[PDB]
Design a protein around this ligand. Structure first.
Ligand SMILES: [Mg+2]
Ligand SMILES: [Mg+2]
Ligand SMILES: [Mg+2]
Ligand SMILES: [Mg+2]
Ligand SMILES: [Mg+2]
Ligand SMILES: [Mg+2]
Ligand SMILES: [Mg+2]
Ligand SMILES: [Mg+2]
Ligand SMILES: [Mg+2]
Lengths: 144, 110, 287, 49, 95
RNA sequence: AACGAGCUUGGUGAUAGCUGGUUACCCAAAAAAUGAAUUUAAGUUCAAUUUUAAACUUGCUAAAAAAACAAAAUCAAAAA
RNA sequence: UCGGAGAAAAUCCUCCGAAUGAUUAUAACCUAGACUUACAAGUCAAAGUAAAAAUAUCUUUGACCCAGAUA
């Protein structure tokens, strides 16, 4: 095989192995909070955008640590099905790849936000202000 | 143009499927294009007149017109307007019906 | 075909029986009769009737519309922009299914051009083909393909099925030879070297995430795994694959064809390839 | 017989093979003809073109 | 303009058109507003915003610009990262 | 042999928003001479009209009350 | 050339002004739908976002090319 001064062997002498690029990274399925694809069940409903749904049983799932599981269930109760599985869907693209990618990122974000305590309450939005004020009126109305 | 390779399972992931064997026994035969596709083409003239063309028809082109009218009549709710060019062997229909006619002609096995 | 039976009954076809297709010819009108004669369609006497009306775009003396609009650089540098023919995965699957592209061997611009899957115009500023994500959902082929540009979604589809994609740069002289190798061979010149990308494109082709042909191989495994996690598929170990040797094949940055080194002469007439022996030439080509 | 493949839906066309050796040698063989050459649509306007 | 040039026998483009207007492949032409860079200190804010916009051309103006340019300027250009990629086509246009 | 600037050839088929002319039959449709800009008003470009082809659906006449006016047109439910 | 007023949608019809300044709470970006309009030019504006914690208040004009001034 012809080789030149710009051949990849000469440009990058250290990685002269034939399979350096084609190997699979050692480990790395544990660090970076890897999501086990096999556990998740993926169904593609073509609603035009191809909707994608990722659902798993939050409590039974063991890859997520138990302390995170409890916080996620309380925080995102609205997304848990009657069977107890956590149902999240994406319908923002015509390619199910991105719809699945959007769904997966939600899992990663949900785990991360539960892991890190949200100490900051931030400013109170008008929606929160209306909710708070009406709650106070209910308390005062129930002076009995 | 190379002959398409034999595939274990049809339809092929792109969607292409070869003509069925045994041959259809209809009065009319619709031949495939040199690229091995069904010869149905969307057309437009004047910038507003939408038409669909079935082109490589051999045999009784009038029998095909009869079947096309019956097949498309329920969808329209009225009989489609069509032109038969017996010299060129093509059938022209007013409106875009390429996808329905492409699926329709696959079932017949052309 | 009953129509052919009609010919049997009819008189002989000859030069005296010929007729054009109906309505294929319009009538040419000459200004001789009263209808189209007389003023001959030009109207009453005036500048227009005498044939001397002002040029197109003249508005009778006021500043014309095409001159009152400010100049703005819409088309500045247009002839120097690079254009990439878009090849979608939908079209790629269609070509593979019908046998026009052979998935067993590596796919380069020559194979796409030979199978008529893509049409390249180097004279019209084409620099090659870009992979386009369209059709990614239904792409189910294992392929080794070399393209000039690629998108993240398109690369994901190729890798998920077990194939390999790399982005490689070809210069205008190299692109013409790659698209049409045989006409080049008939010229009788030796194969030229492939020029490296312009400084603008060096970052693109030296980046692992784009699978650049000048990028570090050591950084490929990390980039390949990252797409797998992002797009929810399991990276396939292609080394175990039987066709790993074909899939791993990549051209040298200065090579236009897979098995032909720069500086060789292809003698198609005698089915031979001639290689130079002069040392100075070999240094030139080997560089 | 035709050396190329005839389409299955079309049957071959045929003609009498003849010889010029003798006056009466009007039939010595039987020859297949490709239907797509000798049985095309009777397109007399294309002949005009 | 020149309909039949002496050297090549072809139509010639009016380069003043090419220097002011952009053609989208669908058939539309884009332009700037006259005076958008002139005497901005005395123009109202809403007026300045109207001037800054890119605006389409009428059917007659489009017909004239088509006559004043040759076919080379009407072709498909596949520019990588083109910012007008989406505007070369018409969608849901019934007419 | 008609000089405010000779004559001949050539440039040269100079140019002329000006005058004159522009060669068979039949069928059909048809403006208007309005508004705008122009060293523009003896011309031209655009609108408006007219027209050919095509697409698909309401148009024309009329039009109550009811507003807008001040104390026959604009608008246009139902119908015919 | 343009604006205001009468005739009242005509006029070589009759008047006043403008090629403005003053005033300042300094008056963003972005964006549905409309007016006006041969073209060009000229008007009004919900929603969203952003500064602040009421808009500027009085009531107009010059295109393209081409030259400037700067960061
Ligand atoms: Mg003529
Ligand atoms: Mg091209
Ligand atoms: Mg004399
Ligand atoms: Mg003349
Ligand atoms: Mg004149
Ligand atoms: Mg002037
Ligand atoms: Mg009515
Ligand atoms: Mg306008
Ligand atoms: Mg608002």
């Amino acid at each position: 095989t012809f080789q030149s001064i710009y051949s990849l062997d000469k440009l990058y002498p250290e990685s002269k192995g034939a399979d350096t690029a084609w190997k699979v990274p050692e480990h790395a399925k544990q660090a970076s909070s890897y999501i086990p694809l096999d556990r998740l069940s993926i169904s593609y409903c073509r609603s035009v955008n191809s909707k994608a749904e990722v659902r798993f049983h939050l409590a039974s799932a063991d890859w997520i640590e138990e302390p995170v599981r409890q916080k996620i269930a309380l925080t995102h109760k609205n997304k848990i099905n009657k069977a107890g599985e956590l149902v999240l869907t994406s319908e923002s693209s015509r390619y199910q790849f991105r719809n699945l990618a959007e769904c997966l990122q939600k899992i990663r974000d949900m785990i991360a936000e539960a892991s890190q305590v949200p100490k900051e309450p931030s400013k109170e939005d008008a929606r929160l202000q209306r909710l708070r004020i009406e709650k106070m009126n209910r308390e005062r109305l129930r002076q009995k | 143009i190379p002959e398409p390779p034999k595939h274990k399972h049809y339809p092929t992931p792109s969607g292409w499927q070869p003509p069925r064997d045994p041959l259809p026994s209809l009065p009319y035969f619709v031949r495939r294009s040199r690229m091995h596709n069904i010869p149905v083409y969307k057309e437009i003239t004047h910038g507003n007149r939408q038409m669909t063309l079935i082109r490589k028809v051999e045999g009784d082109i009038w029998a095909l017109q009869k079947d096309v009218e019956e097949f498309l009549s329920p969808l329209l709710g009225k009989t489609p307007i069509t032109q038969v060019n017996e010299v060129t062997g093509t059938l022209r229909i007013k409106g875009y019906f390429d996808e329905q006619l492409k699926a329709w002609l696959l079932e017949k096995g052309f | 075909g009953t129509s052919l039976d009609l010919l049997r009954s009819l008189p002989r076809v000859s030069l005296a029986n010929l007729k054009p297709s109906p309505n294929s010819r319009k009538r040419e009108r000459r200004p001789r009769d009263r209808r189209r004669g007389r003023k001959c369609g030009r109207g009453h006497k005036g500048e227009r009737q005498r044939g001397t009306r002002p040029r197109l775009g003249f508005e009778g003396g006021q500043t014309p519309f095409y001159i009152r609009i400010p100049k703005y650089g819409f088309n500045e540098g247009h002839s120097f922009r690079h254009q990439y023919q878009p090849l979608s995965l939908r079209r790629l699957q269609y070509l593979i299914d019908l046998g026009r592209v052979d998935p067993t061997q590596p796919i380069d611009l020559t194979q796409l051009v030979n199978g008529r899957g893509v049409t390249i115009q180097p004279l019209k500023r084409d620099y090659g083909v870009q992979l386009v994500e369209e059709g990614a959902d239904t792409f189910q082929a294992k392929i080794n393909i070399e393209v000039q540009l690629a998108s993240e979604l398109a690369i994901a589809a190729i890798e998920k099925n077990g194939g390999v994609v790399t982005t490689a740069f070809y210069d205008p002289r190299s692109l013409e030879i790659l698209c049409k190798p045989i006409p080049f061979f008939l010229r009788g010149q030796p194969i030229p070297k492939r020029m490296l990308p312009p400084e603008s494109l060096v970052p693109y082709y030296t980046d692992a995430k784009n699978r650049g042909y000048l990028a570090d191989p050591a950084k490929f495994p990390e980039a390949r795994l990252e797409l797998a996690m992002k797009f929810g598929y399991v990276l396939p170990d292609i080394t175990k694959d039987e066709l790993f040797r074909m899939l791993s094949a990549r051209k040298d940055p200065r090579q236009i064809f897979f098995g032909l080194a720069p500086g060789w002469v292809v003698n198609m007439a005698d089915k031979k390839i001639l290689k130079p022996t002069d040392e100075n030439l070999l240094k030139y080509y080997s560089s | 017989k035709c050396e190329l493949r005839i389409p299955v839906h079309r049957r071959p066309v045929q003609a009498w093979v003849e010889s010029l050796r003798g006056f009466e040698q009007e039939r010595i063989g039987l020859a297949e003809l490709h239907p797509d050459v000798f049985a095309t649509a009777p397109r007399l306007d294309i002949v005009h073109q | 303009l020149t309909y039949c040039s002496t050297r090549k026998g072809k139509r010639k483009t009016v380069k003043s058109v090419v220097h002011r207007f952009l053609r989208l492949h669908s058939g539309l032409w884009l332009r700037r507003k006259a005076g958008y860079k002139k005497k901005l200190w005395k123009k109202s804010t809403a007026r300045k915003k109207r001037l800054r916009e890119f605006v389409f051309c009428s059917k007659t103006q489009s017909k004239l610009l088509d006559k004043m340019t040759t076919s080379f300027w009407k072709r498909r250009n596949w520019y990588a990262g083109d910012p007008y990629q989406m505007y070369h086509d018409r969608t849901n246009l019934r007419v």
